[PDB]
From a paper:
Here we present the structure of the human β-cardiac motor domain (cMD) fused to GFP determined without drug (Apo structure) and with OM bound (OM+ structure). The protein was crystallized without nucleotide and is in the extended, near-rigour conformation.
The structure of the cardiac MD::GFP chimera (cMD) was determined to a resolution of 3.2 Å for the Apo and 2.25 Å for the OM+ crystals. The drug-free Apo cMD crystallized in space group P1, and with OM bound, the protein crystallized in space group P21. OM is in an extended conformation that lies along the SH1 helix (698–707) and is adjacent to C705 (SH1) on one side and extends to and interacts with the first strand of the three-stranded β-sheet of the converter domain. There are four potential hydrogen-bonding interactions between the protein and drug that involve A91, M92, S118 and N711. However, analysis of the protein–drug interface indicates that OM binding results in extensive solvent shielding of residues that couple the structural elements that are central to the conformation changes of the recovery stroke: the SH1 helix, the relay helix and the converter domain. Comparison of the Apo and OM+ structures reveals changes in the β-sheet that propagates out from the drug-binding cleft and results in a twist of the final three strands (β5, β6 and β7) of the sheet affecting the β-bulge and the HO-β5 loop, key elements of the Transducer region.
Residue numbers in the entry: 2 to 205, 209 to 405, 412 to 624, 644 to 851, 855 to 943, 946 to 956, 963 to 1014
Amino acid sequence: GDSEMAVFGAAAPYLRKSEKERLEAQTRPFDLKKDVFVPDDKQEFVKAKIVSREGGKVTAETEYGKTVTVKEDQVMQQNPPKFDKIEDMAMLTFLHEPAVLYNLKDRYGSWMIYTYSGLFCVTVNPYKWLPVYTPEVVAAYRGKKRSEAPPHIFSISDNAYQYMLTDRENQSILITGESGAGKTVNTKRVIQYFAVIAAIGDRSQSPGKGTLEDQIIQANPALEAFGNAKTVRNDNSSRFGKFIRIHFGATGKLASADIETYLLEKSRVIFQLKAERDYHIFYQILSNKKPELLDMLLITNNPYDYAFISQGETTVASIDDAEELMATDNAFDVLGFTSEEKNSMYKLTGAIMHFGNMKFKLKQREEQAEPDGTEEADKSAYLMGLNSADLLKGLCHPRVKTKGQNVQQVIYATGALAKAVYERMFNWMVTRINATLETKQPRQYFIGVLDIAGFEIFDFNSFEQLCINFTNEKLQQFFNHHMFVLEQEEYKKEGIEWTFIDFGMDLQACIDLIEKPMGIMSILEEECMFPKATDMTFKAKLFDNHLGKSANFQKPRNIKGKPEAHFSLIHYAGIVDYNIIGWLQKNKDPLNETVVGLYQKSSLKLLSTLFANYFQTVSALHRENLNKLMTNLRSTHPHFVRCIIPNETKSPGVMDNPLVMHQLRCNGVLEGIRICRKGFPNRILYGDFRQRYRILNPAAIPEGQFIDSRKGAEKLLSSLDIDHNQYKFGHTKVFFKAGLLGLLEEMRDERLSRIITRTQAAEELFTGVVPILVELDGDVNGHKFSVSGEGEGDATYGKLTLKFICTTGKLPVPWPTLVTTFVQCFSRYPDHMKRHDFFKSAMPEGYVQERTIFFKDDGNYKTRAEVKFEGDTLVNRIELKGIDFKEDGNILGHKLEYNYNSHNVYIMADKNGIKANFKTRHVQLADHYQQNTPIGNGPVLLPDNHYLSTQSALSKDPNEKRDHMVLLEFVTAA
Ligand SMILES: COC(=O)N1CCN(Cc2cccc(NC(=O)Nc3ccc(C)nc3)c2F)CC1
């Protein structure tokens, strides 16, 4: 309702449309039989309208106008309009891939970027400023359960906070997405929200300016200068994963915080694709906004003077590198870094710029490298606190147990050293930030925010992707297991006896293949400890150990125009081809240990600290960090946020179906649907079930007040031709397999469809004024008489007007005893009761109206009429037989008044017809026992218990010689 949305002010249209909008959208034309989804080559899925069918093929017209034919089993139902832009997609009737996709797309196209799907909060990058993050919207989300407000990431944050205070247990919020999907912005939103609402925070010996909240928030511009970069998909992309824990003490007050980082993209430091930059800090320093830095670093202000940082782009329209240097330098001040610490970091950064400018050439006629120039090597060693001759001597002639390098190797070696200094500098800075955020105030609970690259499949997938995907496999298993426990709780609460093996188990084989002994990483680790091992011997040890034995391990699918791969892995998100060139190298990450010896002895304390503790391979460390991350996550109640990148052109409002589909298959959303689908995903309250699927068998669910809805559903379902094992009865709901409710929904559309046909046929049979002929042949107490009637009928107004003439003299019985006997098909059924118009539905074949009228005093009429169309005219042909009538009685002795009273005709059903019962007052009592039955061996509408309200007006035509009756009757159903 609209008033509930008032509290959101200007944000409201971006969170939920008004009931006026929503009313319209849910009245749009829809045919469950024609409006479908079909697969599509270029778009994955598209809507389509079915045009024709034959031989188990379907022909349809795509929403793009393309004619297509497809196998019947490839056609999927659309959800009806009541479900348009639904806020939680777990409520959809049809919950297949295109239904999810098109709900997202519909919501996003109306500027609603947030959507729930079960546990998931789904966020679509808007590419546009939205007014939904104001203080007013913060206030309106405080303390609300998820269901009490529109979808929003504030809901996730506020609830995670309240769960911690209320349950006194750790919480985590897991945020994934592809690069550019908006993980980093969402992560900041969530942490800013904690800083706004968290209770402080009793005061007590720690570096930093401001409050802990200021410091937590300032860790961002600090880390982003060294860990973020202009990529093709995002001007400000994090190239590292991040887990931040915000700690609270025993009474719920903000206590401290710590950050862990993962998987910094080292390669970016010395290499860029054409449309990308290196990390921000290089261009920030180069902005000359703090000129003493250019002097301290022995550099110009031209990035193109530096090979490591100028292979792609060097300026970004959206980024003022000058302003950002101040933000970076300010952040290091707030976090309590000394000027020595700060400057030492700037120096190492300048040193790395120079490193990549050092040139080398070949000796006169040898294959040995020697320095070409020496200037840039000099500037570099100086900043690093090292001897320049020692540096260049280390590079060219390393010591083992000792020498030998060509130009290729030297160029390779300096590049690896640049990357290693930079990575270890990054870790150092994070540990220093952690030292500021450490307040030594007691901690009892935390809220962990994890922000890491999601599962991604590239054209070329190498060792780094394997690490990403392994992590995400472990994170998806974690979700599955959590989803399993909640499902069990739900089936238990409802008393449904169901179970299955833990959903997290489905991912165990993939995980074991990667992580157990003799698994892929174990082999890689074993192999790079062998000096003579090669990429080819590695390939072999994997195949020899797993091809044929581990089903998730497979031959590469070497597809189309995609680069060479060596094996393929079956992950939850799909099958991935891995290229294993260079993995022995990447895993052991060899460094020139002569030059590392110099770093260790540097006079610059920082550089010396960075290599102090210098065996461990990349994969062993990753395993260690992941295990530490998962132990933390498993101690929490988790919440999951999915970021979606809608398109590749930063365009607001528009979605590429395939891009979004890939993401949905990879990020857990479709996974979540699949595993709940193992059980009984569709759940319906007994009340809603009756008020929706009654029409399938109206007999088994009576009408009225106090109705036993569980019995109604148990009787109705038991009476259909369906797999009775595909539903179970809980305390308050019916649980359905997805296929079965989808069938009930098709059957309902079919039954509803037949009805609309039959009622339409039966109204265009009574459109216009309709001619009536009435014929009676009476026989009361042995005295025959005959009445004839002629008049006009008009069902639209529920009016009829007839003249009746006794064509055999004076009438043996009073005229008001023949009204009930003298065409209820002219009743006006309201525009909403029409399916209950039995009389019209029996036409033109007509119906038999048999009656038995017992009069109080006298005897009784036995009536049998046939009411059928007969040309363009409606004929009511009655035969009557009054018997055992008192000759002195108020009937036969013409005692009754010349008037009629209003009655209700109480209609029930039978089978193929109806039956009524009513008592007429004249004042003489008379009870009617009416039965109607069709005459055509064809379908008629049996109605729910209802009554006809009838009014009858007896008059005389003053000009009529013969004994007669003029009648006016007004009849309407209710
Ligand atoms: C991202 O995907 C996932 O994580 N999942 C989303 C969908 N899943 C399937 C599922 C499981 C449990 C209950 C429901 N449905 C619901 O509660 N009521 C309901 C109401 C009316 C009708 C026709 N069907 C059901 C349900 F869809 C739940 C997790």
